[PDB]
Amino acid sequence: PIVQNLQGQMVHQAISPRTLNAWVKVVEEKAFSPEVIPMFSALSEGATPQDLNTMLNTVGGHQAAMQMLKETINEEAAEWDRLHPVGEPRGSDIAGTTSTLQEQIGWMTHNPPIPVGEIYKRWIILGLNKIVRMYS
Ligand SMILES: Cc1[nH]c2ccccc2c1CC(=O)N[C@@H](Cc1ccccc1)C(=O)N(C)c1ccccc1
């Protein structure tokens, strides 16, 4: 996640193994109940796309669900590019596939900012909503 350090520079703090376990624990315990959504949000405060990918990648099994989530992300990335045919970030940059941590932090702190972690979080939550709907 992005944090303000004591200096207060805005910098990246490494994602915690505790956060990753907490995320997998909720997915496994609640079996993609609606409860997964607020938990995903609570665990991803300040997340960069790199952080979010590391979170999502720790979910094992649920291959079909994860594939659906990836397709939702791909669709949102393509829609971003349709509405932003110039400039940076690209949709793939928001999803962290073609961007670096430094690029992500730069966009998040730019003036004006492009909150790429929040945008990606929104896309992921849209994907999670479809999974939740499907598994209900
Ligand atoms: C190699 C592979 N095959 C998959 C099939 C389904 C889901 C994930 C994978 C992967 C790894 C995989 O692609 N994981 C994703 C993160 C991810 C995980 C789970 C769901 C959605 C996004 C990832 O690391 N990146 C860079 C990524 C992010 C957005 C779109 C495409 C790729």
Side-chain angles (χ1 to χ4, degrees), residues 53 56-57 63 66-67 69-70 73-74 95-97 120:
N53 286 328
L56 296 179
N57 281 324
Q63 279 180 260
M66 292 315 269
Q67 184 65 40
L69 175 52
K70 183 178 183 162
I73 291 163
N74 285 160
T97 72
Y120 192 26

Side-chain angles (χ1 to χ4, degrees), residues 67-130:
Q67 184 65 40
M68 283 186 51
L69 175 52
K70 183 178 183 162
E71 157 72 355
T72 296
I73 291 163
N74 285 160
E75 289 189 336
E76 291 296 323
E79 182 67 4
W80 177 273
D81 287 349
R82 180 169 81 118
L83 306 184
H84 310 252
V86 303
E88 305 294 2
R90 294 279 90 209
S92 56
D93 289 322
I94 294 163
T97 72
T98 55
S99 61
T100 70
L101 180 63
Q102 284 189 248
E103 282 177 284
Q104 291 160 22
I105 296 293
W107 292 313
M108 292 162 348
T109 59
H110 188 260
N111 266 283
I114 307 108
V116 293
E118 289 310 298
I119 300 160
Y120 192 26
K121 274 162 65 180
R122 194 179 65 77
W123 299 352
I124 289 159
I125 290 161
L126 296 167
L128 288 174
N129 270 240
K130 303 228 68 141

